Amino acid sequence: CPRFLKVKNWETEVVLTDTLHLKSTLETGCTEYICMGSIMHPDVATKDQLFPLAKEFIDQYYSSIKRFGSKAHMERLEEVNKEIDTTSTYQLKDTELIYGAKHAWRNASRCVGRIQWSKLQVFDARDCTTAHGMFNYICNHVKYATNKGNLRSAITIFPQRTDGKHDFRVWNSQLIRYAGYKQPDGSTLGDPANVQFTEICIQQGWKPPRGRFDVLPLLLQANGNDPELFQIPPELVLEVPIRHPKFEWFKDLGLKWYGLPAVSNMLLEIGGLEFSACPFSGWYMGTEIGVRDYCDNSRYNILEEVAKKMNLDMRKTSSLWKDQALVEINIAVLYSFQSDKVTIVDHHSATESFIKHMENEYRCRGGCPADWVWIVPPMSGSITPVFHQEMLNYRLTPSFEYQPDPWNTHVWK
Amino acid sequence: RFLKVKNWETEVVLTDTLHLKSTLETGCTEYICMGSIMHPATKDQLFPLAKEFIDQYYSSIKRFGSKAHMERLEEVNKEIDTTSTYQLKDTELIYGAKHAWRNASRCVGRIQWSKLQVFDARDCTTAHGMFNYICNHVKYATNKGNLRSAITIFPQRTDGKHDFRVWNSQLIRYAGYKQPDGSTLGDPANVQFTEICIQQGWKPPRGRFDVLPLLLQANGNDPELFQIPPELVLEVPIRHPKFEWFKDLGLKWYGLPAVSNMLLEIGGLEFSACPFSGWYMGTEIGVRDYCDNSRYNILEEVAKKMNLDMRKTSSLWKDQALVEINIAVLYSFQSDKVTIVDHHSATESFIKHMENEYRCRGGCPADWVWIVPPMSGSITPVFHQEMLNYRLTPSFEYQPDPWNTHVW
Ligand code: HEM
Numbered sequence: 001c002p003r004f005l006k007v008k009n010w011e012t013e014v015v016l017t018d019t020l021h022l023k024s025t026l027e028t029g030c031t032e033y034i035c036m037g038s039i040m041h042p043d044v045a046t047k048d049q050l051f052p053l054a055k056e057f058i059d060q061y062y063s064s065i066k067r068f069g070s071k072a073h074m075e076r077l078e079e080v081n082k083e084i085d086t087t088s089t090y091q092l093k094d095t096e097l098i099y100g101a102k103h104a105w106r107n108a109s110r111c112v113g114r115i116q117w118s119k120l121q122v123f124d125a126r127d128c129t130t131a132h133g134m135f136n137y138i139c140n141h142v143k144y145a146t147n148k149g150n151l152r153s154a155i156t157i158f159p160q161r162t163d164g165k166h167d168f169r170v171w172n173s174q175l176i177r178y179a180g181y182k183q184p185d186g187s188t189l190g191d192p193a194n195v196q197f198t199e200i201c202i203q204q205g206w207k208p209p210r211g212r213f214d215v216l217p218l219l220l221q222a223n224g225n226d227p228e229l230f231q232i233p234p235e236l237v238l239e240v241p242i243r244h245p246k247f248e249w250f251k252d253l254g255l256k257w258y259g260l261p262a263v264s265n266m267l268l269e270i271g272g273l274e275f276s277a278c279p280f281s282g283w284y285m286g287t288e289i290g291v292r293d294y295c296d297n298s299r300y301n302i303l304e305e306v307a308k309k310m311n312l313d314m315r316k317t318s319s320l321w322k323d324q325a326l327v328e329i330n331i332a333v334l335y336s337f338q339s340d341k342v343t344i345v346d347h348h349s350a351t352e353s354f355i356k357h358m359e360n361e362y363r364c365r366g367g368c369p370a371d372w373v374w375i376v377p378p379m380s381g382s383i384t385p386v387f388h389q390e391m392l393n394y395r396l397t398p399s400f401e402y403q404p405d406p407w408n409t410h411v412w413k
Numbered sequence: 414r415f416l417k418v419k420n421w422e423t424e425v426v427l428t429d430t431l432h433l434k435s436t437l438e439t440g441c442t443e444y445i446c447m448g449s450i451m452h453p454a455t456k457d458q459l460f461p462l463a464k465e466f467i468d469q470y471y472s473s474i475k476r477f478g479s480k481a482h483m484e485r486l487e488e489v490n491k492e493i494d495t496t497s498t499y500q501l502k503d504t505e506l507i508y509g510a511k512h513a514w515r516n517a518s519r520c521v522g523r524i525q526w527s528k529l530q531v532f533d534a535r536d537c538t539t540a541h542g543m544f545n546y547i548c549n550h551v552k553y554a555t556n557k558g559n560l561r562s563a564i565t566i567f568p569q570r571t572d573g574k575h576d577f578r579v580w581n582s583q584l585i586r587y588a589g590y591k592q593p594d595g596s597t598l599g600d601p602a603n604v605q606f607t608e609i610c611i612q613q614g615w616k617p618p619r620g621r622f623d624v625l626p627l628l629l630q631a632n633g634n635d636p637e638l639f640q641i642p643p644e645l646v647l648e649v650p651i652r653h654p655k656f657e658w659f660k661d662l663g664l665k666w667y668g669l670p671a672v673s674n675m676l677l678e679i680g681g682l683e684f685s686a687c688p689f690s691g692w693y694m695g696t697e698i699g700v701r702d703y704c705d706n707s708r709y710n711i712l713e714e715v716a717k718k719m720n721l722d723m724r725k726t727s728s729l730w731k732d733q734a735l736v737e738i739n740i741a742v743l744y745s746f747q748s749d750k751v752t753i754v755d756h757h758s759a760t761e762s763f764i765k766h767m768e769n770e771y772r773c774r775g776g777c778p779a780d781w782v783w784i785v786p787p788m789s790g791s792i793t794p795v796f797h798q799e800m801l802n803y804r805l806t807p808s809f810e811y812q813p814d815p816w817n818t819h820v821w
């Protein structure tokens with residue numbers, strides 16, 4: 001593998017040099033002869049597998065704090081080693097855990113919000129033992145992160161996996177999402193993406209209101225046990241009704257969204273330890289709601305109804321009626337969040353900050369992995385600077401990983 | 414191994430077997446993906462390349478291992494042996510050029526791949542010859558507005574000292590001028606080329622849309638200037654179906670998109686001069702040509718005339734202005750009966766083409782980064798389509814700008 005890889009920005013002519021890729025730990029899916037960069041997805045670890053993984057991370061941690069080679073460093077290496085030998089695992093110090101989560105975010109190729117990576121509140125919930133305990137921690141996370149509209153990024157880390165038969169898991173894919181109900185007639189009420197999960201919740205005992213925007217309950221699994229339902233207190237679920245600065249009729253659509261974007265199905269890997277339940281949250285880029293949640297055909301799919309209210313010619317596609325509605329919807333989303341003083345960032349500002357962040361990373365770290373396919377916003381791509389930016393993709397560790405949906409693996413008791 | 418690709422909207426799963434056929438690299442490795450990087454002979458090298466191509470040619474016409482296939486292999490071997498190169502049959506040239514289009518990972522218009530007018534210009538010897546051939550191409554392809562896809566193929570490379578080259582990156586483009594006050598008149602992407610034209614004798618009109626002359630190099634010789642006769646150059650005045658003030662922007666574009674700077678590789682032969690042309694997807698003009706900061710950069714002007722609040726980025730004024738520009742471009746071309754496809758229609762056709770390719774060919778190489786339109790990405794179906802990228806031959810490759818190689 002080559003020592004220096006250059007990427008270029010095609011609108012500013014800036015060239016950056018990447019050395020960090022040499023520290024790549026995992027496979028990307030690509031080979032010499034095929035590229036899988038647009039493919040969405042291209043039992044525990046033995047003692048022997050864990051030893052070098054742990055050392056790798058510990059070395060890296062003591063390297064970050066400018067104590068590489070120190071007594072404290074060597075002592076820590078030895079402590080971790082004995083712990084692995086005697087217990088087949090080890091426990092992270094609170095300092096290491098914090099470093100590891102911040103760096104898993106820093107290494108997330110697909111997150112455009114990474115300029116903020118070092119400002120992350122880490123709630124250590126490794127003492128949790130029950131689903132009620134998980135609910136408590138989760139509620140505290142939500143309230144802290146929401147902060148009455150002034151969102152602050154955060155992660156709550158439940159205990160690491162042990163034997164695989166005692167995982168903690170948040171079954172929800174996000175802490176806050178709306179239900180989706182399939183009708184006997186084929187139509188979907190609510191969010192079609194969440195139909196399967198809503199069916200599971202209803203089966204577990206949830207009494208559904210059956211509306212368009214029903215906040216799903218939390219489904220919480222502690223210590224490998226069956227999961228349990230909890231309704232998040234409504235006063236902790238900040239929501240924004242969507243209106244438009246020009247079109248008075250826009251509020252008549254009755255749209256709203258939740259303020260807090262919180263991913264809860266990913267797995268946090270630090271030094272070979274797997275934290276299978278690690279809900280994290282930041283704040284929204286407008287396009288996530290205005291383009292994807294609202295306009296994807298398999299989601300809320302409102303383009304037709306908005307365009308109809310805009311009295312647009314909808315016969316030919318070459319009128320770009322879809323395109324026109326899309327912009328107005330995204331204008332509305334940004335306008336509504338800013339009006340109710342809930343943090344949100346537009347795709348222009350976010351991508352511009354990411355370019356600045358990426359350049360700084362190259363300067364100070366010798367690189368910054370990024371996934372162009374995810375980093376480029378799903379509307380008006382080329383009018384943002386990331387589009388013109390060459391990016392290298394590669395997986396560093398600590399990292400956030402995907403994991404199977406828990407209903408597919410859970411052994412019911 | 415067989416690879417699945419999934420559409421996340423429709424949930425359709427195609428199975429790729431075609432990728433197993435490729436030998437050329439893509440630039441990625443197992444640990445690093447370079448999917449967004451713009452750019453990641455001898456007798457001995459030449460025959461296996463020749464044999465490969467001839468084999469897939471006789472296979473595509475169900476005459477594999479036939480007498481004709483055998484004699485042809487013999488013919489090509491003897492010819493490489495005694496001349497260090499070899500010449501393609503007419504049939505092979507056509508098959509080869511259509512398949513270079515078909516294999517073009519980055520081209521969204523490939524549903525049309527087998528409708529390609531191939532112009533064999535291999536008898537060419539001079540730049541005057543080149544200009545004649547190109548004018549015929551332009552006139553045929555333009556077809557009064559009912560565009561027809563074409564490629565013109567000039568003599569293959571020999572020793573590298575005798576390349577045929579179209580110095581222009583496209584047959585039809587607009588000049589670009591560095592103003593004394595630091596700004597750029599016309600197309601900034603062509604400032605250098607324009608200067609090379611001016612240095613060479615071209616008297617520039619110094620306007621915002623001056624069709625550049627052709628600069629043609631034949632047989633490794635100094636390039637020569639030629640003006641395409643204006644009556645062969647179809648141009649569209651851009652206007653808007655609601656905004657009457659839009660024509661007052663004075664914007665115009667040319668109807669014929671013709672890439673002239675690439676290299677067509679067939680059976681290990683290199684055709685350094687092979688201008689090809691299709692028709693426009695609207696975004697190429699409306700999004701990239703008109704709205705890139707490094708290009709015509711009109712967003713500010715347009716949003717001005719739309720009286721938009723331009724103080725904050727979160728007003729999405731850029732996005733608004735963008736949609737209108739692209740509406741205007743489509744409306745204009747359509748009003749002039751000049752062929753053009755919008756990004757919804759085109760991407761739809763591409764999904765259909767992918768499905769076709771998977772059925773009959775076991776796959777379709779594709780560059781998601783290039784296939785997804787540079788506006789309204791996820792409201793087009795290609796955004797939700799997993800694409801596998803790999804390099805098949807025959808192929809269109811990039812090559813150096815000739816003013817970095819040529820000695821005078
Ligand atoms: C602070 C404001 C943040 C912004 C503006 C932001 C922005 C984004 C966006 C737009 C996506 C694309 C999601 C999609 O299209 O499905 C994303 C993905 C992601 N972000 Fe963030 N993010 C933020 C905070 C965070 C934090 C705090 C973390 C972790 C500690 C994080 C880690 C990730 C990861 C791991 C993904 C990939 C998710 C997946 O693959 O499904 N982000 N981010």
Ligand code: HEM
Pocket residue numbers: 510513514517519520521522523525529562563564672689690691692693694697754759783809
């Ligand atoms: C028939 C109508 C066609 C349409 C609508 C179409 C569409 C497109 C578009 C939108 C691009 C992206 C250009 C860019 O963003 O720089 C592209 C690239 C390309 N097309 Fe086409 N195309 C057509 C015909 C053709 C033909 C006839 C050929 C060859 C015989 C061809 C070969 C290519 C190649 C090699 C590229 C890559 C260009 C590069 O790498 O710079 N296309 N096509």
Ligand SMILES: N#Cc1cccc(CNCCc2ccnc(-n3ccnc3)n2)c1
Pocket residue numbers: 040111113174261262263280281282283402
């Ligand atoms: N696997 C998978 C998979 C495929 C498509 C979309 C997905 C969602 N990924 C995260 C989406 C999402 C939602 C809310 N918030 C955030 N978020 C919050 C902070 N950073 C991102 N991200 C997962």
Ligand SMILES: N#Cc1cccc(CNCCc2ccnc(-n3ccnc3)n2)c1
Pocket residue numbers: 451520583670671672689690691692811
């Ligand atoms: N090198 C290089 C390089 C990098 C990015 C874009 C580029 C231009 N690509 C072609 C643009 C263009 C122009 C006119 N016509 C067409 N066109 C027509 C049919 N297919 C493409 N394409 C070159």
Ligand SMILES: C[C@H](O)[C@H](O)[C@H]1CNc2nc(N)[nH]c(=O)c2N1
Pocket residue numbers: 037038039040373374375376421796797798799800
């Ligand atoms: C097929 C393709 O990879 C898929 O649709 C991707 C494209 N890029 C994306 N980019 C972001 N940010 N989020 C997504 O969900 C996707 N989906």
Ligand SMILES: C[C@H](O)[C@H](O)[C@H]1CNc2nc(N)[nH]c(=O)c2N1
Pocket residue numbers: 010387388389390391448449450451782783784785
């Ligand atoms: C850096 C990045 O690869 C570059 O900006 C690409 C992105 N995708 C593109 N897609 C198309 N169709 N045409 C282009 O010129 C580009 N440019």
Ligand SMILES: [Zn+2]
Pocket residue numbers: 030034035036037441445446447448
């Ligand atoms: Zn790749």
